[PDB]
Amino acid sequence: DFTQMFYNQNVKQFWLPEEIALNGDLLTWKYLGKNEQDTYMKVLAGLTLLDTEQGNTGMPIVAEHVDGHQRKAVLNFMAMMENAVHAKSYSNIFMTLAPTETINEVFEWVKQNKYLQKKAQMIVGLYKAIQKDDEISLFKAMVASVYLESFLFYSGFYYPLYFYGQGKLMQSGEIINLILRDEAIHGVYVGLLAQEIYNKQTEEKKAELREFAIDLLNQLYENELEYTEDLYDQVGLSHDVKKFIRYNANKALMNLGFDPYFEEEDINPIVLNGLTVEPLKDDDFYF
Amino acid sequence: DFTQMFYNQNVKQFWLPEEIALNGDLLTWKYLGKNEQDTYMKVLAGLTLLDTEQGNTGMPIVAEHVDGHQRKAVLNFMAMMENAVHAKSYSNIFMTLAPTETINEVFEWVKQNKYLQKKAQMIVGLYKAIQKDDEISLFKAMVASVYLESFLFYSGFYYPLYFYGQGKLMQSGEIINLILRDEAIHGVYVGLLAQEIYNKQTEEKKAELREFAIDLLNQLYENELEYTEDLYDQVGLSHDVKKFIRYNANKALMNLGFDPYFEEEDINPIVLNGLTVEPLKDDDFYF
Amino acid sequence: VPKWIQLNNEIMIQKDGKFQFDKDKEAVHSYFVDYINQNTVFFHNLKEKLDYLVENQYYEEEFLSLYSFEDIKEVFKTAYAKKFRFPSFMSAFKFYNDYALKTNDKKKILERYEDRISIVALFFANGDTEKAKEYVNLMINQEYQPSTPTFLNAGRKRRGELVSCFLLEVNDSLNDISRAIDISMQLSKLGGGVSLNLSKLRAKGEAIKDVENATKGVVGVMKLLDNAFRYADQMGQRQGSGAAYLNIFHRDINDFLDTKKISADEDVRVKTLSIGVVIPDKFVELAREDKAAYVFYPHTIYKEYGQHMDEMDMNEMYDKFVDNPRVKKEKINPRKLLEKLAMLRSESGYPYIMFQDNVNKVHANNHISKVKFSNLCSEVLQASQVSSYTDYDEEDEIGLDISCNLGSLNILNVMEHKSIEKTVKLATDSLTHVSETTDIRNAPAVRRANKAMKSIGLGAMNLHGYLAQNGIAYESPEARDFANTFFMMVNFYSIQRSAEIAKEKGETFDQYEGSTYATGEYFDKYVSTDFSPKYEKIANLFEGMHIPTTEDWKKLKAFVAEHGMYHSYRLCIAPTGSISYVQSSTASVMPIMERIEERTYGNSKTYYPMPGLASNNWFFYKEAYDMDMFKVVDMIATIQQHIDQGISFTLFLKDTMTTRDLNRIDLYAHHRGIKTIYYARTK
Amino acid sequence: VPKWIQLNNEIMIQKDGKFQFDKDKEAVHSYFVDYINQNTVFFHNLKEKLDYLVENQYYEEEFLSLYSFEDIKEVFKTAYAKKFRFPSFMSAFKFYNDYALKTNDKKKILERYEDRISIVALFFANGDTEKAKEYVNLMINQEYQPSTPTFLNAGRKRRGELVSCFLLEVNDSLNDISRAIDISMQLSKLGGGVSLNLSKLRAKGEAIKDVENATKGVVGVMKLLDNAFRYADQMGQRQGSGAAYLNIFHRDINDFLDTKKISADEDVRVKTLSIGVVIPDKFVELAREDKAAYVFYPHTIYKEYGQHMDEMDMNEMYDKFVDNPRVKKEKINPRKLLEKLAMLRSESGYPYIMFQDNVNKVHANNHISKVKFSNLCSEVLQASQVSSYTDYDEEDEIGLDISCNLGSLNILNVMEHKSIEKTVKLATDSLTHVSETTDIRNAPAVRRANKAMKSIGLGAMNLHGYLAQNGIAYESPEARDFANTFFMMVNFYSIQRSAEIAKEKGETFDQYEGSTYATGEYFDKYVSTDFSPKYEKIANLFEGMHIPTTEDWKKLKAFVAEHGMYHSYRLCIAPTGSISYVQSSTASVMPIMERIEERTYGNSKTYYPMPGLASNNWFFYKEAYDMDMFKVVDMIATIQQHIDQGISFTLFLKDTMTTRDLNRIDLYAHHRGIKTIYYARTK
Ligand SMILES: Nc1ncnc2c1ncn2[C@@H]1O[C@H](COP(=O)(O)OP(=O)(O)OP(=O)(O)O)[C@@H](O)[C@H]1O
Ligand SMILES: Cc1cn([C@H]2C[C@H](O)[C@@H](COP(=O)(O)OP(=O)(O)OP(=O)(O)O)O2)c(=O)[nH]c1=O
Ligand SMILES: Cc1cn([C@H]2C[C@H](O)[C@@H](COP(=O)(O)OP(=O)(O)OP(=O)(O)O)O2)c(=O)[nH]c1=O
Ligand SMILES: [Mg+2]
């Protein structure tokens, strides 16, 4: 009942980072403190890693196991967006704002950062555990994918949105909003596929799947807290970002057909502001 | 040396089925004989069936085994074009020209056809034989992929190009020309990835891979001749189609860095009409 | 968020199911009381203010010195006697952000609306205190609105040229192309839009000095012009705007159109240059019959006949060109070209369409020259003569380049005051003064044509606003009846004022004797046809005003024959883009685009309801995109029969309309006498 | 494949481990016998050939009308009596593909080498049969090669100008910029390269008529000029080439340099415009001391002092500009700018480097003006005065532009014939005739400066060829000794010929009395120093030739003081690229880039060994990329001390060299008195 409308929405949202000129951010970037620039680079690098694996591994593997040519076409399109559009856009931003050495250093930093490695290990592990014709392993990977789309990106998205909302780094911010617009529909779509599998189960099996989903969310959440503190303490925003990731965790659960898990909190209002041809016939010449 | 350049060329060639209005083809379709309509339907179904294998297996399997983030992104983009753009385009052409019952029957016939099946299963067999961390099996699959993209499609493309060059079925011919333009670049790109593997091999292993490629080409070519007579004798075109197959076989070989196998021939003119910074050290100023 | 912006944003907050239109009066009141009265430079009296403005290089002292200070004080008191109040926030905002004089630091407001109007009236009167008071009453009543250049710059030392529309003929030579680039940069530097005719340039692949395939065509000249207009960006606040016009029978027509394709290569794309196409009746005839057409190489025609292709009658010369072996031509599909034009207009809104035969079958000055192209706004249609710019140390052969200073009657206010005749005559006098005070020092042909032709453009605005505020549908027959009567009266009184000026000054425009005014052929339809309203509702709107009859037109014809006509051109309906807000009027004679105009200024968004918009007249304020473009064409053709120049005619198209719908609209406009089509706007 | 091309390709086929150099003579003989003789039109006699060429609009009949046909026949016999044979295939191929006159269809050959030489000699002699015979002997002996424009176009009706290098001063105004664009287009239409000085244009962000931040800077004018040169690309036969020069102290220097960055945006990037930088000694001094430097806004300086920044002495006025609050300036890092120049030259070979103080410390016409910029080849160094182009109908203040007609001495042939004096004097006469017969009617400053200054450029070629064929290393002290002696003799005889021409015509060049020639300061080093060879081997090379001594230089100084000088500038060593093949010589005074040149003509690859290359002189034909650029700088500085204009100096860099090595080479060249550096070529 939904794939065709998602197909149409995905293809109509198609974009390339080159459509957005980035030289306009040069001055507002120059004006940020060293702490702010450091957090910003690292945040986008963490996002780049997530999209790299979502494009290389997550979306293609889910596409392989989901039945139906139209469902596969949507998932293939989403995969392309992840690595050919999203992951690449971050390099466009980096190449504009930062010198090569700072770019090299931040990519080295992703490799050695323990929270980023842990979250990649956990998510990619679940993708690679999918067994052919085994719907339960597929469900588990789809939960992981929804958590990546609708929860994990948001510790990263906070900062570009926070600046966009203050009228700073608005070209980079425009790119990020386009990425976010895509991930929102990706999270909903994968969520609907996960619910299909969940709804086939006995009540006993469903109870276990909810346990899996909640245990996984909590494990990812605890790691994301440490990641958030590590990045944001130097810019004074860790508590604010934490509220934002909890907000988005609830959206991820909802995408999976589950009740919200965290209590509602006031999000920084700055971040909220950050959000034919037909031929002419002979009679056409007479009136 | 080449992936970013191909990335650029691929994304700038992006297109969607909806861009070409198909209904005006009915004004020339109605004037074709039964044999012409039959051949066109059968050719179209042949292309559709082969392209589906490439979208579901060929491109995604190569993307899976190739190392490199940028290569995986380009390959993902190509897989997207197969599944999201090409497959929808072929379906659109069919739905415009034939009623539902006729489409189902043509696909039943072509699905049972000996020459179409022989080539489809030969290609798919090589994709299924790729082994993790074995570059020889990957190379063999890449050869199969290049043969599909740059050679096997062309016994089929001949007919739409033949009409397109005569002013018949111009809307569907425009679509086919866009598809063909994508397959050409797909073949060249996968060809470069195969040459990379080939160049890492010993001289004895190279000679062995050359023998593999020529042997495979021979098997496919002999089946193409039979496929060609089976479809084109009823419309009197087989001689010219055979010249077009050999010409495209030579292009496929050149994509794989190999010499042409067949002597140069002229092609039907109607089909042609269709087609180191270092700083100064305060002593450089004294002599 | 300022208080006035908060009040204005309350417009869209529906209360009781209806928009709170009364919030705009509150919004404007708060805007004034909290920003304008605070940020207005204070002067004890008018004498001190005028002395400060003149001393600080704000006001030119030349025009002010013609009046005794008592006269200036009386004029200023006349301006303030009306107690004029801006009825909506947007009008006052536009005035005090675009036209109100501000200190050099742009922090304080030196001019109120009354001060600006009084200065403009004093500039117009040229020493006549009673004339100045009449101008003050005309503008304070908002019956007549001088164009943005005249209104903003009049009486200002830093002021640019009061004329802003320029048309240049380019001759087929490197000297002429260089001179055209120089003149375009010079005129853009003055802030005026420059339109060039490229139909005389030889096509790509033509020979230069018996060297074949040497010419780069009109697209290389277009690249040069685009770079020149980009360089002369007028401080960059308003990017340099230029238009290039090419005849449809030019060889480079396809390349000329390809410059506006999004898929076009960047080395061919022309970003800052608008393009218009001149379509003779011959092309429409060829497309109607589906006959194969030919595009000609202009230099071959010029060599064969000694005259330019665009200087000849294509309806008489097309067959001779086709049959002449010495003329080089290539075959085209006229219907394919029309479809390409429709597709390009849908994608980018370009090119402008000029129907040459529609323009020249009613042109009064065909003896001087035929109208070969239009301006950047597509409403200027005048005879032009190309110049011959020779080598250095060689005398130049200065031709005639087109220019006109613009003014707009406020139809609603002119009808409310029942002052069509007086308003038209005062506007004609002000336009004549602006024309006589213009002297372009780097456009010899522009200056010569301004001196010789004395062309003025008197437009109109608030047609849709007036009709909606009177219970008349824009597309209805009654709307066309009112437009017919009103613009017939406007033409009558502008002709009468031109003849009276010619009688008083003793001179007519150059080559007036050969014009249709002199021979009387202009007045045939006016002396033979009655243009009084045919509907009682429309006839009542003109009650209290004398509608000229056939006898009145006969008398005017005799008077013109006796005394001649001072202006070669009098009436043109320009878009009137930003000055309509100040007048609280709808733009030009076009239907409104939106009922409520939502715009973002700074970081706060503002809402502008159409003037007079209310629940009772909500349905009469139908948006253009919802309108039948055939009825809009009918209305514009009704108006155009009384306008000697063109009318900026924007096409408002829905996204669902195919290229065939646009082609049919263009064909109906050509059939109905439409001279030019400005833009294809899609919703 | 042609038989001659197969014979030529046998050059590279090693036989006995040695190149088959004798195969080139067979290749040229086969080329002639099989193509040139076949495709050469046949004429019964010279009278018939001359009649056919004149009537068919191939030759200008005016210059041939000054001789009786007997004299023309005698001149042609003199040219043919030599029985000149091309020594290599490439020489004849280049001549008969570029300079040999061909029928209008480019199918047959109407001129041989002798015919072209005779026509050029008759054009030079201007009606003198004995002088024409002398010119024929000079050219057929290949002692002198007229520049490509003169050689190709002399005596031809459908010809471009014989002068091909022009330098334009641009004043800071819209009129001046538009006139500069027009003049550049007019001069490129003539085939000449145009260099423009942009140092008087105000920098980006300067005020235009007391409105701040209105100026686009030199980059907008650069885009205008680039489009103008692209448009006027010589009918497509040769893309329009122009050069822009900016003083290093101009504020737009970084934006000016960034136009040549590969990563530069297409909006700012300039594609077809060469860029050179004028570096005063002040900038080098600042970079040497690592002191923070300032780049100035030219218009602020002009307003403060009334003069242009490039019209003032930077070495003296830099501190005053820095200390003047009314002069706007931007802090820069001089060493960072130097390194940016080095990196830009490594990546693209730009910009050209002009060392202003090196040029002007020896400049003989500083009273007329300082040298502010160079030409498109970086070897023209003359005083220029900017023109003031005013509004239309106003009088223009025409200044002095720069243009010189070039000719090259063939050093090997001149030394073999022991005819330095005769060759130099005849070349001076021919260059004077070319200058006298030149008249550009669309570049008033160029025409005025040509008439007033009478500037010529007498270059030299085959320095490396002559040295290698005589067993002398290009980098050896003996080579520098020979260059010193030879160019001292060339300068002596060119000065003597200029004085003789001034005496014969009784007229010097404008403002000669203020020149260093008039005051005698020019001859100080020549009267105080000796330039005879210090090596016996070099001294033997000049046997049979009189080497001017200090007494000779004193006599020449007295003669010049008595009679004056006809030419403001006489000597400039241009790159001389295309005609080097015809002359069978190494290009200019630069070392050879490659011993054997591999070229592709169509689908056939041609092999060109360096003229005179053989097994016994292989080591002396050292490639430029393998030489020490310091030794090349030493050679060029030895030559430059006898050239009044500049020497087109290309740097040949290996890919391993860093930007520091390029900077060191530049600093050594500045230290050694180098005036300009042309290109940074990397291998
Ligand atoms: N809508 C408006 N358009 C133009 N000027 C206005 C407007 N509203 C206020 N002003 C200016 O602000 C002044 C103060 O406005 P306000 O309505 O408070 O005046 P008032 O004391 O009631 O009397 P009056 O209307 O006669 O000025 C007005 O005199 C006028 O100068
Ligand atoms: C000089 C030049 C002209 N043109 C075009 C622009 C002009 O419209 C056209 C005519 O150039 P002209 O300047 O008129 O050349 P011409 O008059 O000397 O030669 P002819 O009499 O044969 O015309 O050629 C180019 O496209 N490129 C060029 O370089
Ligand atoms: C008109 C104009 C000038 N310029 C630059 C180019 C000129 O070198 C410089 C001066 O222009 P000018 O033509 O000299 O303008 P002006 O003389 O009226 O103003 P001023 O009294 O200050 O000299 O401004 C632009 O960059 N863009 C423009 O549109
Ligand atoms: Mg001409």
Ligand SMILES: [Mg+2]
């Ligand atoms: Mg100026």
Ligand SMILES: [Mn+2]
């Ligand atoms: Mn993503």
Ligand SMILES: [Mn+2]
């Ligand atoms: Mn996603």
Ligand SMILES: [Mn+2]
């Ligand atoms: Mn496909």
Ligand SMILES: [Mn+2]
């Ligand atoms: Mn493919």
